[PDB]
Design a protein around this motif. Structure first.
Motif, PDB file in Angstrom:
ATOM      1  N   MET A   1      -3.781  -4.129  11.305  1.00 31.93           N
ATOM      2  CA  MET A   1      -4.651  -2.968  11.506  1.00 31.93           C
ATOM      3  C   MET A   1      -5.858  -2.974  10.587  1.00 31.93           C
ATOM      4  O   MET A   1      -5.806  -3.548   9.508  1.00 31.93           O
ATOM      5  CB  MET A   1      -3.846  -1.689  11.178  1.00 31.93           C
ATOM      6  N   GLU A   2      -6.883  -2.201  10.963  1.00 29.39           N
ATOM      7  CA  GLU A   2      -8.084  -1.948  10.184  1.00 29.39           C
ATOM      8  C   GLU A   2      -7.722  -1.322   8.822  1.00 29.39           C
ATOM      9  O   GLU A   2      -6.862  -0.426   8.739  1.00 29.39           O
ATOM     10  CB  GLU A   2      -8.982  -1.002  10.960  1.00 29.39           C
ATOM     11  N   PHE A   3      -8.388  -1.810   7.770  1.00 28.56           N
ATOM     12  CA  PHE A   3      -8.184  -1.387   6.398  1.00 28.56           C
ATOM     13  C   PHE A   3      -9.122  -0.233   6.051  1.00 28.56           C
ATOM     14  O   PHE A   3     -10.302  -0.269   6.408  1.00 28.56           O
ATOM     15  CB  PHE A   3      -8.409  -2.589   5.452  1.00 28.56           C
ATOM     16  N   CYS A   4      -8.580   0.803   5.375  1.00 27.90           N
ATOM     17  CA  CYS A   4      -9.336   1.976   4.928  1.00 27.90           C
ATOM     18  C   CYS A   4      -9.068   2.123   3.455  1.00 27.90           C
ATOM     19  O   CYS A   4      -7.979   2.541   3.070  1.00 27.90           O
ATOM     20  CB  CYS A   4      -8.926   3.223   5.707  1.00 27.90           C
ATOM     21  N   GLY A   5     -10.061   1.733   2.665  1.00 29.38           N
ATOM     22  CA  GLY A   5     -10.052   1.647   1.203  1.00 29.38           C
ATOM     23  C   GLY A   5      -9.604   2.836   0.386  1.00 29.38           C
ATOM     24  O   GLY A   5      -9.130   2.653  -0.736  1.00 29.38           O
TER      25      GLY A   5
ATOM     26  N   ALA B   1      -4.411   7.479  11.929  1.00 24.29           N
ATOM     27  CA  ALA B   1      -3.490   6.355  11.854  1.00 24.29           C
ATOM     28  C   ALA B   1      -2.078   6.814  12.215  1.00 24.29           C
ATOM     29  O   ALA B   1      -1.849   8.013  12.383  1.00 24.29           O
ATOM     30  CB  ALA B   1      -3.489   5.767  10.450  1.00 24.29           C
ATOM     31  N   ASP B   2      -1.140   5.855  12.326  1.00 29.60           N
ATOM     32  CA  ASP B   2       0.258   6.112  12.657  1.00 29.60           C
ATOM     33  C   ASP B   2       1.145   5.391  11.653  1.00 29.60           C
ATOM     34  O   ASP B   2       1.458   4.220  11.835  1.00 29.60           O
ATOM     35  CB  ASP B   2       0.549   5.663  14.116  1.00 29.60           C
ATOM     36  N   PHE B   3       1.508   6.066  10.568  1.00 29.92           N
ATOM     37  CA  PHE B   3       2.418   5.498   9.574  1.00 29.92           C
ATOM     38  C   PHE B   3       3.851   5.508  10.096  1.00 29.92           C
ATOM     39  O   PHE B   3       4.659   4.682   9.683  1.00 29.92           O
ATOM     40  CB  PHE B   3       2.374   6.304   8.276  1.00 29.92           C
TER      41      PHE B   3
ATOM     42  N   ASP C   1      -2.864  10.820  -0.098  1.00 30.69           N
ATOM     43  CA  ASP C   1      -3.047   9.946  -1.297  1.00 30.69           C
ATOM     44  C   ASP C   1      -4.211  10.457  -2.158  1.00 30.69           C
ATOM     45  O   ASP C   1      -4.118  10.473  -3.390  1.00 30.69           O
ATOM     46  CB  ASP C   1      -3.371   8.485  -0.894  1.00 30.69           C
TER      47      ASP C   1
ATOM     48  N   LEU D   1       0.825  -1.208   0.000  1.00 34.83           N
ATOM     49  CA  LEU D   1       0.000   0.000   0.000  1.00 34.83           C
ATOM     50  C   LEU D   1       0.860   1.259   0.000  1.00 34.83           C
ATOM     51  O   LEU D   1       0.566   2.200  -0.735  1.00 34.83           O
ATOM     52  CB  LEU D   1      -1.023  -0.003   1.151  1.00 34.83           C
ATOM     53  N   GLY D   2       1.939   1.231   0.779  1.00 33.94           N
ATOM     54  CA  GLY D   2       2.886   2.328   0.885  1.00 33.94           C
ATOM     55  C   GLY D   2       4.069   2.006   1.768  1.00 33.94           C
ATOM     56  O   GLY D   2       3.889   1.543   2.897  1.00 33.94           O
TER      57      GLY D   2
ATOM     58  N   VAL E   1      -7.859   4.175  13.695  1.00 32.79           N
ATOM     59  CA  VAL E   1      -7.738   2.813  13.142  1.00 32.79           C
ATOM     60  C   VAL E   1      -7.713   1.773  14.260  1.00 32.79           C
ATOM     61  O   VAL E   1      -7.035   1.965  15.278  1.00 32.79           O
ATOM     62  CB  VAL E   1      -6.573   2.558  12.150  1.00 32.79           C
TER      63      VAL E   1
ATOM     64  N   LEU F   1      -6.662   8.592   7.476  1.00 33.87           N
ATOM     65  CA  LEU F   1      -7.234   7.621   6.540  1.00 33.87           C
ATOM     66  C   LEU F   1      -8.722   7.796   6.307  1.00 33.87           C
ATOM     67  O   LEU F   1      -9.462   8.323   7.151  1.00 33.87           O
ATOM     68  CB  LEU F   1      -6.936   6.189   6.971  1.00 33.87           C
TER      69      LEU F   1
ATOM     70  N   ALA G   1      -4.916  -4.255   6.929  1.00 31.61           N
ATOM     71  CA  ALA G   1      -3.672  -3.625   6.494  1.00 31.61           C
ATOM     72  C   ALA G   1      -2.602  -4.110   7.456  1.00 31.61           C
ATOM     73  O   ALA G   1      -2.855  -4.216   8.663  1.00 31.61           O
ATOM     74  CB  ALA G   1      -3.788  -2.105   6.537  1.00 31.61           C
TER      75      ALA G   1
ATOM     76  N   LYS H   1       1.200  -3.381   8.821  1.00 29.99           N
ATOM     77  CA  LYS H   1       2.343  -2.487   8.935  1.00 29.99           C
ATOM     78  C   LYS H   1       3.597  -3.308   9.319  1.00 29.99           C
ATOM     79  O   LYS H   1       3.705  -3.782  10.451  1.00 29.99           O
ATOM     80  CB  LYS H   1       2.051  -1.390   9.971  1.00 29.99           C
TER      81      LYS H   1
ATOM     82  N   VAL I   1       3.549  -0.768   4.546  1.00 29.70           N
ATOM     83  CA  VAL I   1       2.185  -1.227   4.807  1.00 29.70           C
ATOM     84  C   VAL I   1       1.702  -2.048   3.624  1.00 29.70           C
ATOM     85  O   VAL I   1       1.896  -1.633   2.487  1.00 29.70           O
ATOM     86  CB  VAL I   1       1.230  -0.041   5.135  1.00 29.70           C
TER      87      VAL I   1
HETATM   88  C1  LIG Z   1       0.279   6.986  -3.508  1.00 28.97           C
HETATM   89  C2  LIG Z   1      -0.942   6.346  -4.153  1.00 28.97           C
HETATM   90  N1  LIG Z   1      -1.083   4.881  -3.936  1.00 28.97           N
HETATM   91  C3  LIG Z   1      -1.815   4.222  -5.050  1.00 28.97           C
HETATM   92  C4  LIG Z   1      -1.416   2.780  -5.318  1.00 28.97           C
HETATM   93  C5  LIG Z   1      -1.433   4.437  -2.571  1.00 28.97           C
HETATM   94  C6  LIG Z   1      -2.861   4.766  -2.151  1.00 28.97           C
HETATM   95  N2  LIG Z   1      -3.120   4.293  -0.798  1.00 28.97           N
HETATM   96  C7  LIG Z   1      -3.674   3.103  -0.543  1.00 28.97           C
HETATM   97  O1  LIG Z   1      -4.059   2.355  -1.443  1.00 28.97           O
HETATM   98  C8  LIG Z   1      -3.832   2.715   0.877  1.00 28.97           C
HETATM   99  C9  LIG Z   1      -4.920   1.994   1.373  1.00 28.97           C
HETATM  100  C10 LIG Z   1      -6.142   1.449   0.706  1.00 28.97           C
HETATM  101  N3  LIG Z   1      -4.741   1.845   2.720  1.00 28.97           N
HETATM  102  C11 LIG Z   1      -3.576   2.455   3.121  1.00 28.97           C
HETATM  103  C12 LIG Z   1      -3.125   2.475   4.460  1.00 28.97           C
HETATM  104  C13 LIG Z   1      -3.613   2.000   5.629  1.00 28.97           C
HETATM  105  C14 LIG Z   1      -4.925   1.299   5.866  1.00 28.97           C
HETATM  106  O2  LIG Z   1      -5.759   0.963   5.022  1.00 28.97           O
HETATM  107  N4  LIG Z   1      -4.998   1.043   7.192  1.00 28.97           N
HETATM  108  C15 LIG Z   1      -3.858   1.470   7.858  1.00 28.97           C
HETATM  109  C16 LIG Z   1      -3.546   1.374   9.213  1.00 28.97           C
HETATM  110  C17 LIG Z   1      -2.352   1.917   9.668  1.00 28.97           C
HETATM  111  C18 LIG Z   1      -1.513   2.530   8.752  1.00 28.97           C
HETATM  112  F1  LIG Z   1      -0.351   3.061   9.199  1.00 28.97           F
HETATM  113  C19 LIG Z   1      -1.786   2.633   7.406  1.00 28.97           C
HETATM  114  C20 LIG Z   1      -2.983   2.087   6.936  1.00 28.97           C
HETATM  115  C21 LIG Z   1      -2.966   3.004   1.977  1.00 28.97           C
HETATM  116  C22 LIG Z   1      -1.633   3.699   1.927  1.00 28.97           C
END
Ligand SMILES: CCN(CC)CCNC(=O)c1c(C)[nH]c(/C=C2\C(=O)Nc3ccc(F)cc32)c1C
Ligand SMILES: CCN(CC)CCNC(=O)c1c(C)[nH]c(/C=C2\C(=O)Nc3ccc(F)cc32)c1C
Lengths: 289, 279
Positions: free
Chosen positions: B77-81, B140-142, B87, B17-18, B61, B130, B34, B36, B21
């Motif tokens: 962790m909980e997922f946030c679409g 959240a805490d990245f 982003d 995701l990043g 989260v 998120l 998700a 981490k 994560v």
């Molecule tokens: C830069 C653009 N990108 C496109 C591919 C990324 C877009 N971003 C994404 O898809 C994305 C999605 C769908 N979820 C997260 C992150 C988290 C999430 O869901 N729960 C968490 C709980 C803790 C945490 F620390 C991060 C997350 C991202 C970066």
């Protein structure tokens, strides 16, 4: 930094444990001069370059009111710091036998500590721990500040690249830490009370509760319990060293011109008087001759 | 809540995701989560995890569990679409005043809760906010927020006698030299960031910004295009960006401000943003 991978027993004879890392009284094998050896337990994951830097901070001190440094020994994952031997121990060791110091004895100690502090601060060093236990007295009644910062900024350097969302107070902590050298001036004000009363203020209060009250708004700086016993000069010295705002707290060089420490008649003879008391604390001989 | 059993046993790894994560699916329920992944003291590790575990609020989260395998720590962790607001706005552009007011209200609810638990987020920014598919706001805490809080709590137990400490030294020993009100200021900067696509001074060298901020007479930032924003928004920025933390309003106090207390602030405003994200 002069850190030798040798065993310290090759150059010095260990004589007696002075206190607790651990400090020992030792004799130089060739000259027979008494030294002090402070032993610090080192962990395997400890970084050598950081130790050399810390030791060099002690090595580069060349002031009469800071204990002299002779050398260091790294042996059996233990560091042995060799320093000037101060025969009477710390002021805490002393006052625990003699009782309260007089106003002139405290004035002389504060003057000597301030001279030590003015030198440290001019070298961009902060003692960070000024208290009776850390102020040593030699056989001549002279005052020395013990070693500082050894085995004690890099974390704060990480956040520095991204300050854009930081509150001004967070940015101030990240850039220069939440304190500067003036913390030593406050610690000396607390030390002057400690020497007069045998305890720092709030010593009977729990460590955590004091920390909370100190940070709490409306926090009143400590004061001497008795009034008339102490001159207006001594009360003012305590009032200005214990200035709440570090932006308004005076520097060590500013304090050196304060009436309490600039007065005439302040010399090591005041401490030799205290030392005499230490030698014979109890009552004189009884009828049993 | 940490386990020694490899996370691939409970979860099927998905796309990154990043970075670190990862998106993952529960092998038995099919639920999206998700993970981490972080690459040493076990006392500080347990302290970090507990800070994350005890966060139980609709605007933070949710923590599911942790895994320690191959010296790597996987935090479930909980997922946030919709990912982070950072982003999102890098695709949609500027948020509207109503979308910002809704985000600020939701963030302040999350902060009032963290602050009531003696927790400080310390890294409030668009990147740490998120958005799920239902247009809901989750803090959240990245980075290392829980690590900082844990490391501070560790330093407290090992803090020597305090009796000779100056009050400013006491403040760093006890709480690193600041309080929960730093999150209020970071929220003020985040609202500008959602409005202008970058926080103020983003184009200026970080060392220069630190010196500018720590100088006397430092002016708190303001929104660049004044006619685009209401008097309530200009004022919310003014009060969240109070230079002195003694005068800075708390998260509960801020929740009664006109901008975030106004009606018609709901997830539907963010749903409009997410559709713009898909367009
Ligand atoms: C830069 C653009 N990108 C496109 C591919 C990324 C877009 N971003 C994404 O898809 C994305 C999605 C769908 N979820 C997260 C992150 C988290 C999430 O869901 N729960 C968490 C709980 C803790 C945490 F620390 C991060 C997350 C991202 C970066
Ligand atoms: C524990 C009981 N003690 C009796 C032996 C109390 C009295 N204390 C003593 O004898 C004593 C003496 C005589 N010197 C020291 C200490 C130091 C010294 O000389 N140079 C230093 C340099 C640096 C340093 F960090 C400590 C010392 C003590 C504690």
């Amino acid at each position: 930094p002069d850190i030798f991978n040798r065993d310290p027993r090759d150059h010095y004879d260990l004589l007696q444990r002075l206190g607790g890392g651990e400090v020992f009284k030792a004799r130089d094998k060739v000259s027979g001069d008494l030294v002090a050896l402070k032993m610090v337990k080192m962990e395997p994951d400890d970084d050598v370059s950081t130790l050399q830097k810390e030791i060099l901070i002690l090595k580069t001190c060349r002031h009469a009111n800071i204990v002299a440094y002779h050398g260091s020994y790294l042996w059996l994952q233990k560091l042995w710091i060799c320093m000037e031997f101060c025969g009477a121990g710390s002021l805490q060791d002393i006052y625990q036998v003699t009782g309260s110091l007089s106003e002139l004895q405290i004035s002389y100690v504060c003057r000597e500590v301030l001279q030590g502090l003015a030198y440290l601060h001019s070298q961009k060093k902060i003692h960070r721990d000024i208290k009776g236990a850390n102020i040593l007295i030699n056989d001549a009644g002279e005052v020395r500040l013990a070693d500082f910062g050894i085995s004690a900024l890099a974390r704060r350097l990480e956040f520095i690249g991204t300050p854009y969302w930081m509150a001004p107070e967070v940015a101030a902590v990240a850039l220069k830490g939440g304190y500067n050298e003036l913390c030593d001036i406050w610690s000396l004000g607390i030390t002057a009370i400690e020497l007069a009363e045998l305890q720092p203020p709030l010593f009977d209060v729990h460590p955590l509760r004091v920390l909370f009250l100190m940070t709490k708004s409306g926090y009143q700086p400590p004061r001497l319990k008795e009034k008339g016993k102490w001159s207006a000069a001594f009360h003012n010295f305590i009032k200005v060293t214990l200035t709440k705002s570090p932006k308004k707290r005076p520097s060590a060089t500013k304090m050196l011109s304060h009436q309490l420490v600039s007065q005439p008649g302040l010399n090591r003879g005041l401490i030799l008087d205290l030392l005499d008391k230490l030698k014979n604390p109890g009552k004189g001989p009884s009828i049993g001759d």
